[PDB]
Design a protein around this ligand. Structure first.
Ligand code: HEM
Ligand SMILES: [C-]#N
Length: 145
């Protein structure tokens, strides 16, 4: 049910993955500035210059398309999520807690841009908790606790 509640509001996201992707990453780097250092291509860009950055928005679109592709899997997602855990633990070297940060930014952006109501915001938090727990279990399989 929580996947359905999110998907019932995904239309505005999927309609403009680049604009919404840029909003998410711009907000993440504003509200959680330590996360920006984890993107060496973007680290050190002054905040004022992030909202207009086409590379930032294109990367945000990649992230949101992947999360769409996870959402629409409704928890049957191993072939999608194992590779993401592998790359994020071993290539990008992202500590797990940062996933909670981007998830909360997404809840805010969807509240403001996608019609996600207070129950919907619960639902997305729950779904992101599923995804993050799976990422974390795969991190541990790789030796990253
Ligand atoms: C569920 C949330 C997230 C999703 C769906 C996601 C998805 C992706 C995807 C699809 C890629 C491209 C393939 C790859 O390199 O693995 C990627 C790259 C990357 N992700 Fe994530 N990601 C998430 C969260 C994060 C967080 C929380 C951070 C850091 C705070 C992060 C940092 C990176 C970095 C640094 C890259 C490589 C950028 C580049 O060099 O082009 N990701 N992510
Ligand atoms: C990943 N951003």
């Amino acid at each position: 049910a929580d996947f359905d509640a999110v998907l019932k509001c995904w239309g505005p996201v999927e309609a403009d993955y680049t604009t919404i992707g840029g909003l998410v990453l711009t907000r993440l780097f504003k509200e959680h500035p330590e996360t920006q250092k984890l993107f060496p291509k973007f680290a050190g860009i002054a905040q004022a210059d992030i909202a207009g950055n086409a590379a930032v928005s294109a990367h945000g679109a990649t992230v949101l398309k992947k999360l769409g592709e996870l959402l629409k899997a409704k928890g049957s997602h191993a072939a999608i999520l194992k590779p993401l855990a592998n790359s994020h633990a071993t290539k990008h070297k992202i500590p797990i807690n940062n996933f909670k940060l981007i998830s909360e930014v997404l809840v805010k952006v969807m509240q403001e841009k996608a019609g996600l109501d207070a129950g919907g915001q619960t639902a997305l938090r729950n779904v992101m908790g599923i995804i993050i727990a799976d990422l974390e279990a795969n991190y541990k399989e790789l030796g990253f606790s």
